[PDB]
Amino acid sequence: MESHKHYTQSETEFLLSCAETDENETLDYEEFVKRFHEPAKDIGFNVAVLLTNLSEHMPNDTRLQTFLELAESVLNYFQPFLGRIEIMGSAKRIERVYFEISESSRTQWEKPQVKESKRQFIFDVVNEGGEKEKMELFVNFCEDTIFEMQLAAQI
């Protein structure tokens, strides 16, 4: 663990005294705090969403900058996991909603058959089709794509 060059050594020993103390020295990595660390991952995810939105609404604050860079490794972990869009949330103003993206849906989105259906859909929405309800046809494609990844993961 210390050969992984990463941590601070007193905190490695903190994790050691945390670890299992399982009767000789043995330890299962999954049963460590890991299984409870994914809800801790959820908490830190929400914290990352929070600090993100703090920077996004109200930028340019060196207090917040120090607090942000203080939380550097969390934003390093969770940018593969966050979800972010923009909408008009009934306030007649441009808004943005930050949210969660699970990973297994991205693994079934990693399936490039979806990507080529997507690129053909790009061709469709650009030219091949009556420009009628653009984003509604997009969401029709999305619901179909949802069903596609349901099929893909369910195998």
């Binding site: 972010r84 869009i85 923009e86 949330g89 949210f99 989105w109 091949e128 195998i155």
Partner: protein, 422 residues
């Protein structure tokens, strides 16, 4: 569960065995090149397995065709039936067309979906049993609870929904891709029976490496005009033949020198098909079949006639074919370059331009990758439907309500949070 797992395997290992079936088709081409007219047979080289691996590889290729049609049934068939059930369910939502509209005799694709609403297990593979009882609730207070009742309606033998399956496979048969691969399997069946037509499996090269397929697309999208133009050509050949039937009944002699029992093309048909087969596969003129200039004053106009054929035929022919094919290529390159335009100038949700968004260190690129990030709206919709509505934020429940409304103004009209202040 053995067979279930194997269907799962054929799903998750589908295109690889498709390309392997193509490679087996190439091996079919490898053999069909040593036949001898005696009945027929095969010659011999140092390899000594012509007939046994012939029969085995034929049965193998047919079995792989069976495997790919079963896998394709296990593949996209639920997605297509998902699209169909979605469309029918929402058209009963937003119209109640079987309640009210009763569409015309066109699209019994659509009226085909009448008799599946008869089934109690109508909206199955669309997860959305909501739609049935909502449409049941929405209109029969106006139009009839009896109308609602009408729009209602190893050992496992008759406890399965038969008419749903009938409707289902009827919708399945409408696919061009499904019928393509099924017909391909029946070609493998006929080659298993008679391996003369067995090498006609080489329309497998019509749905692989896509550039040939775009060339075939350049063929097929314009082809109505092509076929009607060839019909116009046939009209020209028809009337042009008829002209050399009234005034011209000596200038053709099919035999040698005419003393041998020659034939002037007098008969309508014979003269019809003669001008077709000669002048289309000509090489410019009918200078072969014409009488050469002997000095007749009729033959002067007959030479002028051959000139009019040459001019008003060959020019027209090349205008038919490669003008239209290069026109097809021009529109194909235009469509692909406009796709590459719109993916790089104005996004779907942005729709402004790359004038505004490159002010900062590559902000247009990140604006694409982050701010509209096309698959993440998909992930967001997943994140909605996965959650419960109690669990929603007011933003989440808001967008959910707008989604149920099918109203779409919640999506940005194009301007963004960079556009408002920056």
């Amino acid at each position: 569960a053995y067979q279930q797992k194997l269907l799962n395997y054929f799903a998750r290992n589908f295109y690889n065995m498709r390309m392997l079936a193509l490679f087996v088709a190439f091996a079919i081409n490898f053999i069909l090149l040593f036949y001898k007219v005696s009945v027929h047979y095969v010659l011999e080289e140092s390899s000594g397995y012509m007939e046994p691996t012939l029969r085995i590889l034929a049965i193998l290729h047919t079995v792989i065709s069976f495997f790919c049609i079963i896998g394709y049934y296990c593949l996209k068939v639920p997605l297509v039936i998902f699209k169909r059930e979605k469309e029918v369910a929402r058209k009963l939502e937003f119209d109640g067309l079987y309640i009210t509209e009763q569409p015309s005799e066109d699209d019994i694709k659509g009226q085909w979906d009448r008799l599946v609403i008869n089934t109690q297990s109508f909206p199955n593979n669309y997860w959305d049993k909501f739609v049935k009882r909502k449409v049941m609730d929405k209109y029969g207070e106006f139009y009839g609870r009896d109308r609602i009742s009408e729009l209602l309606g190893s050992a496992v033998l008759n406890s399965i929904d038969v008419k749903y399956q009938m409707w289902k496979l009827g919708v399945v048969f409408t696919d061009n891709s499904f019928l393509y691969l099924a017909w391909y399997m029946t070609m493998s069946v006929l080659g298993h029976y008679n391996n003369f037509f067995f090498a006609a499996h080489l329309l497998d090269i019509a749905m692989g490496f896509k550039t040939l397929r775009t060339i075939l697309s350049s063929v097929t999208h314009n082809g109505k005009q092509l076929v009607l133009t060839v019909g116009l050509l046939a009209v020209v050949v028809y009337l042009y033949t008829v002209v050399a039937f009234n005034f011209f009944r000596k200038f053709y002699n099919k035999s040698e020198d005419g003393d041998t029992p020659d034939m002037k093309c007098d008969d309508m048909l014979t003269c019809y098909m003669f001008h077709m087969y000669v002048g289309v596969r000509a090489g410019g003129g009918i200078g072969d079949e014409i009488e050469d200039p002997a000095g007749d004053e009729y033959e002067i106009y007959r030479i002028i006639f051959d000139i009019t054929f040459f001019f008003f035929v060959i020019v027209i022919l090349l205008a038919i074919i490669q003008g239209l094919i290069i026109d097809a290529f021009g529109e194909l390159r235009d469509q692909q370059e406009q796709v590459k335009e719109d993916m790089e100038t104005k996004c779907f949700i942005c729709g402004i331009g790359n004038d505004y968004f490159d002010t900062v260190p590559h902000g247009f690129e990140t604006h694409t990758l982050q701010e509209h990030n096309l698959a993440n709206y998909l992930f967001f919709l997943m994140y909605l439907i996965n959650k419960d509505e109690t669990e929603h934020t007011g933003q989440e429940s808001y967008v959910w309500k707008m989604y149920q409304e099918r109203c779409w103004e919640f999506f940005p009209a194009g301007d963004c949070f960079r556009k408002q202040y920056e």
